[PDB]
Design a protein around this ligand. Structure first.
Ligand SMILES: *[C@@H]1O[C@H](CO)[C@@H](O)[C@H](O)[C@H]1NC(C)=O
Ligand SMILES: *[C@@H]1O[C@H](CO)[C@@H](O)[C@H](O)[C@H]1NC(C)=O
Ligand SMILES: *[C@@H]1O[C@H](CO)[C@@H](O)[C@H](O)[C@H]1NC(C)=O
Ligand SMILES: *[C@@H]1O[C@H](CO)[C@@H](O)[C@H](O)[C@H]1NC(C)=O
Ligand SMILES: *[C@@H]1O[C@H](CO)[C@@H](O)[C@H](O)[C@H]1NC(C)=O
Lengths: 371, 379
């Protein structure tokens, strides 16, 4: 029989939805079938997200897989938590300890702070994207205070496409007056590519500059265009193309028909997409585990019912999700009691003239290791 | 034009006084005998939220929307703000609020509280602060933190920035103050809630950093609610900001009625200190009354009974009268307890004044506005 689940996907998150579908095939099993109800929406719009959630709730889903952003995360956490509906997501982990949310994405803060120390930086620029949220900036500034770092923090959010190219050039001119050659980019893939383009245009991809790319997808970026100038470039990668699990997956993914699977037919997968595939494994494994434990699960009505009516089996589903431990595209997958990734590994990368090189890793049990 | 305009009231924990001020402001509006100033009866439906999470606020909004409101007065916090603004914007329902003014450019939100960042930046300029500690919480948004970071870059400041909103144990505040004192830090910008400002200043006094070589800039419009007595006595400088002038007619008029109220009917009126948020609440009712009087005079359609139907109706079709209601709220110019009240296109206060205080009791040292910037008085 079927287990209905919700899928809340941002508009144009094609590669993620392809990875979701590939996961549904790869992890299908004799004990049950996952049957997804897909809403595509504007994830920054809390009204839209509330309508989709309530719509899924009324159809009677057993969990929801999805994405939120800084603006809608309080909607997801509050409704999931109230109604005991588990949310599984590759989005940025929440700031506190909200229940009924399973966070596929490992925390970056610990590794980033260790890497600053590893290179012995005590003076740097930090380019942050206010449209994406501010908790990594807050951590970095708190550490700066504790450790006496001098941080030049510059907002690269809220930039009209009109003058994006011109704004970045003036930002970097001002940095050269202060003679600042060490820069961290706390942005995701698109904005990183935009900034890198302007760094190259003004000739600051040359020897004597160091960029740390502060996201979990180092090689998701177009690195080849900054690979030959002479600047140092470092980053983080949670998908290891040398693991055999990942190369086996890439054999099939790279040969999928791009017309049927948008964003496939490539030798890399964005970490967001990889975590989505991994989410299908986590959800499958949770429901299989409920059967091994002979914990029976069948039975949602009005989203805005007064009083709030949360189903009894919600806690059981949550608990099974959070007890999963598997190997996926993102390494070992395990969760603490608040659904945060634990016991994970983040590979530390540096760009060289022959391609990105893995120099070590950061682990959630210890800290930075050179390999 | 209808006989009755009804509004919504969304109140949270810790809005007892504001709730009394709301009811009293509506009673002042309704008991006016002049029919030109009172051409419709103002009604309200209030919801009290034991907590302000997204689920409970969505629930309240929808029942208010269904019952029929022409606007909603209320409070948000960091946890509820995005939900409210998103729902008001999709359904063309104007929210009027004394909460922290928002980061984003949004529609259908009238923000009674003036932004503080400009006054803060002008005073840091006036005092020539280039090296200082910045202690902040995020309960009023990120505007100030972003402005401080950006001005640090432009002016080559050394800012030691420490997030303090999650500190529960007072020994952590002590440790921070002692570490900063070892680095010879003498200047503190405190960008916190009043109650957290009080906690911090008790630690300052316990450790003797309330003496003459120290300067505390308090970045919070509830200056009169901060406990400053023990700090004055030690000799440290203090700088604060207010938006209420107790010598304006509008304020003297409100206060002489407010001090006479029965506390059984209006809790926390009478002799309790008047919070600036309660003046902002009163001011909201002036804004609402003015806008609807305007719509009446101009013979604009506001609908018979207000909003109607299901907040989660799909597709969402906003009522046609919403845009005219928003424009009428946004175009007002009135004199209130918080001075000249006007709004820009995003519902932010504009052409407002902030009064600047320093400590000795406390004396008003100057004023700030958008055009003149900081204007110090003689001395
Ligand atoms: C680039 O890396 C080398 C070490 O491999 C280091 O000596 C140099 O300082 C780095 N460049 C910058 C600008 O920090
Ligand atoms: C942590 O991950 C490692 C490597 O994948 C795994 O083999 C080990 O058993 C895990 N440890 C715990 C405590 O779950
Ligand atoms: C109030 O009524 C008086 C007497 O009819 C009138 O002169 C006045 O203009 C009215 N409206 C006001 C003051 O807004
Ligand atoms: C205290 O205020 C005076 C002006 O009255 C100012 O000149 C002095 O520098 C201030 N103290 C500190 C420690 O900044
Ligand atoms: C600002 O407010 C004053 C009264 O305080 C008013 O007379 C003036 O016209 C306003 N200015 C603008 C530019 O709106």
């Amino acid at each position: 029989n079927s287990i209905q689940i919700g899928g809340l996907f941002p508009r144009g998150a094609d590669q993620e939805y392809s990875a979701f579908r590939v996961g549904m095939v790869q992890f299908s099993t004799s004990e049950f079938r996952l049957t997804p109800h897909i809403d595509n929406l504007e994830v920054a719009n809390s009204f839209a997200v509330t309508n989709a959630f309530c719509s899924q709730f009324s159809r009677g889903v057993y969990a929801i897989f999805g994405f939120y952003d800084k603006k809608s995360v309080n909607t997801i956490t509050s409704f999931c938590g109230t109604l005991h509906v588990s949310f599984i997501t590759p989005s940025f982990p929440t700031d506190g300890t909200h229940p009924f949310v399973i966070q596929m994405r490992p925390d970056l803060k610990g590794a980033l702070l260790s890497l600053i120390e590893y290179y012995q930086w005590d003076k740097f620029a930090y380019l942050y994207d206010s449209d994406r949220g501010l908790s990594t900036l807050q951590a970095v500034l708190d550490s700066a205070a504790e450790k006496k770092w001098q941080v030049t923090a510059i907002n690269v959010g809220n930039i009209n496409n009109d003058k994006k190219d011109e704004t970045y050039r003036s930002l970097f001119q001002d940095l050269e007056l202060k003679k600042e050659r060490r820069v961290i980019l706390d942005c995701e893939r698109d904005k990183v590519n935009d900034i890198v383009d302007q760094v190259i245009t003004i000739g600051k991809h040359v020897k004597g500059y160091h960029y740390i790319i502060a996201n979990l997808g180092f090689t998701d970026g177009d690195l080849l265009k900054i690979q030959f100038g002479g600047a140092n470039v470092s980053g983080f990668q949670i998908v290891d193309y040398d693991d055999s699990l990942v190369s086996k997956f890439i054999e099939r993914w790279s040969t999928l028909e791009e017309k049927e699977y948008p964003g496939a037919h490539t030798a890399t997968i964005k970490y967001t997409s990889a975590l989505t595939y991994d989410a299908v494994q986590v959800m499958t494994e949770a429901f299989r585990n409920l059967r091994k434990q002979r914990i029976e699960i069948s039975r949602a009505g009005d989203c805005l019912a007064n009083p709030a009516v949360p189903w009894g089996q919600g806690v059981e589903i949550e608990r099974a999700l959070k007890q999963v431990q598997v190997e996926g595209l993102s390494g070992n997958i395990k969760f603490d009691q608040n659904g945060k990734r634990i016991n994970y590994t983040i590979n530390i990368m540096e760009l060289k003239t022959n391609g990105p090189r893995k120099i070590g890793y950061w682990s959630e049990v210890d800290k930075m290791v050179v390999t | 034009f209808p006989n009755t305009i009804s509004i919504g009231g969304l109140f949270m924990r810790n809005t007892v006084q504001e709730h009394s001020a709301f009811r009293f402001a509506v009673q002042l509006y309704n008991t006016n005998q002049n029919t030109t100033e009172k051409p419709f009866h103002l009604n309200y439906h209030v919801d009290h939220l034991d907590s302000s999470n997204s689920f409970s606020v969505t629930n309240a909004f929808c029942s208010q929307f269904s019952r029929g409101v022409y606007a909603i007065f209320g409070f948000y916090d960091q946890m509820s703000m995005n939900t409210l603004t998103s729902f008001c914007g999709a359904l063309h329902t104007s929210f009027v609020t004394p909460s922290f003014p928002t980061d984003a450019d949004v529609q259908f939100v009238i923000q009674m509280r003036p932004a503080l960042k400009g006054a803060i930046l002008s005073l840091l300029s006036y005092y020539k602060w280039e090296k200082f500690v910045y202690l902040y919480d995020t309960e009023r948004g990120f505007s100030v933190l972003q402005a401080i970071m950006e001005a640090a870059v432009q002016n080559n400041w050394q800012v030691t920035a420490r997030s303090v909103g999650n500190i529960k144990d007072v020994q952590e505040f002590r440790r921070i103050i002692e570490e900063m004192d070892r680095r010879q830090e003498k200047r503190y910008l405190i960008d916190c809630e009043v109650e957290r400002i009080n906690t911090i200043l008790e630690q300052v006094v316990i450790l003797g950093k309330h003496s003459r070589g120290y300067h505390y800039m308090l970045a919070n419009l509830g200056f009169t609610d901060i406990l400053l007595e023990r700090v004055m006595h030690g000799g440290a400088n203090i700088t604060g900001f207010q938006i209420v002038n107790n010598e304006n007619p509008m304020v003297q008029q409100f206060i002489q009625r407010w001090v006479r109220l029965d506390e059984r009917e209006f809790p926390e009126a009478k002799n309790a200190p008047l919070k600036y948020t309660s003046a902002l609440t009163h001011d909201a009712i002036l804004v609402i009354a003015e806008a609807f009087r305007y719509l009446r005079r101009q013979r604009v359609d506001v609908s018979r009974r207000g909003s109607a139907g299901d907040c989660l109706a799909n597709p969402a079709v906003p009522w046609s009268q919403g845009i005219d209601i928003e424009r009428a709220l946004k175009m007002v110019q009135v004199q209130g307890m918080t001075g000249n009240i006007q709004f820009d296109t995003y519902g932010r206060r504009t052409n407002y004044t902030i009064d600047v205080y320093e400590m000795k009791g406390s004396r008003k040292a100057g004023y700030w506005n958008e055009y003149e910037r900081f204007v110090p008085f003689s001395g």
